Amino acid sequence: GPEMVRGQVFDVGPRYTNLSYIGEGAYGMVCSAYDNVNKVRVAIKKISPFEHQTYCQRTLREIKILLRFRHENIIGINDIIRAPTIEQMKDVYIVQDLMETDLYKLLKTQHLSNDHICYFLYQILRGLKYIHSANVLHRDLKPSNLLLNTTCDLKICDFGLARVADPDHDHTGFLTEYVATRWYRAPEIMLNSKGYTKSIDIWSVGCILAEMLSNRPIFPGKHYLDQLNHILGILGSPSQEDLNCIINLKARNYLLSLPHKNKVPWNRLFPNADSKALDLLDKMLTFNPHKRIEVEQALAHPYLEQYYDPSDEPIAEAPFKFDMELDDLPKEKLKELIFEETARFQPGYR
Template identity: 60%
Template sequence: MSGSQQLNSRLKNFNAGDQYEIIDVVGEGAYGVVCSAIHRPTGQKVAIKKITPFDHSMFCLRTLREIKLLRYFNHENIISILDIVKPRTVEEFTEVYLIQELMETDMHRVIRTQDLSDDHCQYFIYQTLRALKAMHSANVLHRDLKPSNLLLNANCDLKICDFGLARSANFSDENSGFMTEYVATRWYRAPEIMLTFKEYTKAIDVWSVGCILAEMLSGKPLFPGRDYHHQLTLILDVLGTPTMEDFYGIKSRR
């Protein structure tokens, strides 16, 4: 099968409307596909994120949460939604198409393919912390910061994406931390989430940023745990064992 045939096969059910000319598939995830495209009326290059969330209530919640938050934020280091393609009829509303800024790559790909200079690391982490300050000032926890969620372009501009797990820092739900443990990416997960503390704070995002910075500098993950127990072992090997006060703060029987 030729390259064009493979592309046509992957885009067979990609219906973003007549205003957009699809160029290529730039990413795929558990419940969505991202394509680069051109907005025909303006010639602007954009990214179109197709989400098919309606098979699972959790995906619906994540999609709604991401749309609400990204429509709220207006920050140069947070990805923005330019438009949402409306379905022609209610019966055809089986997919969601988000039109977003087009970025060329992500931090995960960059780290895997090249060494970063200290100047690059400094500039990238500066932009990440600018975005984090904006989120935390709005009492929003991202909860899934990792290299693949830091989008980059050739000018070294950085934008944080994927707010499907984000939530208010004031949100109170005794099961929320428990659920996050099984969804958020383990290598960048703060210990208090793995230990299912009853409450956690904005510090969980700061932990993730620290792990990302270490990976930028070394070119490899700081705590690449194989499973839950191995992850904690790697962390304790570096940071030492917790104090008794911390120990008694652990509520999980596991």
């Protein structure tokens, strides 16, 4: 019959066998398996998105982007398995390089040395440099989306919320819904931004750097608005100039309605941290997204000086483009596009 794991068919045989559970998450079990062709254990994520129209959006953009990207610090797609017809296609299996852990799990069981933190940050920013050079935003960076192995190699994964950048259409209203993980959301997400600019990913990296420095999320909000209160709990109330930058008056008055908060100095929060790391952290976690440091400026910061090397930091061929976007297309048209996009892996084909 068809192999299966924890009362669930993982119909990846005969090529992939000897399965073993890793974990779940984005409506999909993840297993390792032995690839009987390439003779190596691989990771396989099972995805069932065709009931819900958003899950289809997230699946298609992920596949499309990850098939186009080629970068040491970004997880690739090695194979995609699905039924040969389509009405049979109820599941999609995406085969990827097997990594050993992720930063989230690592931080649960280890305090990182400064040397380790510096190197992990470099790799995160090296990967991000590539993504942003394609004008793509990851939009959900966090420790559990950073895969690792014992040799300290790092790969960014989970491009389900990724989009082509779009600063022209970034403006949105106060309190707009959002899907990305609360603790890593830039302040402007709660104020006037849909997260369509590169500064949104830099904020998230700053959050991760703070977490590596202390093994504690720096901004653990419990609810939507509470998240913004935590951020101001460290940054302090916004400056006059920064208040004005905010366009719509609703968000502007909400900020005015908050009690004044004193800025907690970085080296008071992290007394044992490298002062160069704190200087870069300060520039990544800046309230005003226009003043926030850019990925190449972060790579060129004194903290990363032993690694920064543009000749060893690939960039993209040219800006990525979605021929048409996916936020209106019905989930049946999306399934079709997922079908064609995955056909290149169907045994046979020319």
